[PDB]
Amino acid sequence: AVETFAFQAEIAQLMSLIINTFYSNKEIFLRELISNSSDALDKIRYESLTDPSKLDSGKELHINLIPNKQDRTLTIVDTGIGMTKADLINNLGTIAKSGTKAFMEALQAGADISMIGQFGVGFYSAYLVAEKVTVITKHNDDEQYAWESSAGGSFTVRTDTGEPMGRGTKVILHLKEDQTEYLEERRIKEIVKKHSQFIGYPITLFVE
């Protein structure tokens, strides 16, 4: 059973701007997704300080980076708080309508696409390098779900019957043909060292 939904007009506008604007500094997508993982890990840690049973679904707090050259995918995994079905449908837990309005006004005044995170819509920078994005998630108060979109004005939501994850979020990037540099070990290492040096959780880069 697969459900199909339309994006709000303002969010479809944000996605078109990211895909069509000429902008060479594409590497910032990785910094934005790692920042979202760190924020989700802080939320489950705070809840555990007053209720230890919040960690019954897994005690380890970390971030894993998994490249696969055969499938042409880059996966970002975390053991954070996760998202409910309602959170996924409501723009992946963001205030995306007001965020998009502020971002567009800043660009007209002199700002650039690298400043996207200051407007709380950093997730959508994934479309600088990916043709399709799949999001697998599990929250302590709901079941495991899968969100998916290739842009074009719509997204899908279904119950996930695949491998259970315990608690957290998994972002799967199906890369564009001319963006395979983001699967090379030396390139990933360089980006993590430059932009993510003050993240307070272990970041493990897997080998092929």
Side-chain angles (χ1 to χ4, degrees):
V2 185
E3 291 177 294
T4 308
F5 300 85
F7 285 115
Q8 281 176 271
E10 299 82 1
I11 286 69
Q13 285 162 32
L14 175 72
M15 296 174 76
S16 291
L17 183 133
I18 293 169
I19 293 159
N20 297 320
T21 308
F22 179 76
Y23 186 80
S24 300
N25 187 211
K26 293 182 182 279
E27 72 182 42
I28 64 97
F29 82 91
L30 190 58
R31 176 191 69 195
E32 299 303 327
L33 299 174
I34 292 170
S35 181
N36 287 353
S37 291
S38 179
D39 289 349
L41 288 157
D42 293 349
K43 295 179 188 177
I44 193 68
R45 180 173 269 164
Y46 185 76
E47 287 194 355
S48 79
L49 301 175
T50 59
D51 185 3
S53 71
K54 291 277 180 171
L55 298 174
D56 284 351
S57 50
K59 292 184 195 175
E60 293 73 43
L61 306 174
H62 61 248
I63 304 165
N64 298 150
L65 308 177
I66 315 172
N68 189 306
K69 288 180 184 75
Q70 284 74 50
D71 299 342
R72 208 208 289 164
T73 61
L74 177 64
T75 303
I76 299 90
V77 189
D78 71 68
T79 57
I81 198 160
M83 288 179 278
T84 63
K85 194 189 180 189
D87 288 326
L88 283 174
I89 296 162
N90 282 271
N91 304 310
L92 303 98
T94 70
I95 53 159
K97 187 174 174 174
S98 62
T100 297
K101 186 189 177 74
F103 185 42
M104 286 181 180
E105 290 180 320
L107 292 167
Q108 290 280 81
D112 69 275
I113 288 162
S114 79
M115 295 158 77
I116 192 165
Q118 293 186 62
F119 309 94
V121 290
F123 166 75
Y124 302 92
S125 71
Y127 291 90
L128 288 168
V129 298
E131 58 183 23
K132 181 174 80 182
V133 179
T134 311
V135 180
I136 316 291
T137 197
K138 175 74 174 73
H139 188 280
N140 283 333
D141 304 333
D142 214 340
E143 296 294 281
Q144 192 167 304
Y145 295 94
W147 178 105
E148 197 169 72
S149 184
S150 292
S154 71
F155 66 92
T156 66
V157 177
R158 71 195 80 191
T159 58
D160 189 40
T161 50
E163 280 295 293
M165 57 201 286
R167 188 199 60 252
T169 298
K170 176 188 273 177
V171 179
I172 308 164
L173 307 173
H174 304 262
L175 302 175
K176 293 171 193 178
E177 206 173 67
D178 69 339
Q179 302 300 321
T180 63
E181 70 190 82
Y182 302 108
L183 300 170
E184 297 292 324
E185 194 186 14
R186 60 183 190 173
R187 185 70 169 120
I188 302 161
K189 281 182 182 176
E190 176 190 46
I191 300 160
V192 173
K193 186 180 172 176
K194 193 201 264 172
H195 301 288
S196 304
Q197 67 279 4
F198 301 115
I199 297 292
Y201 299 96
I203 302 164
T204 307
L205 175 56
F206 284 33
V207 180
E208 291 185 74

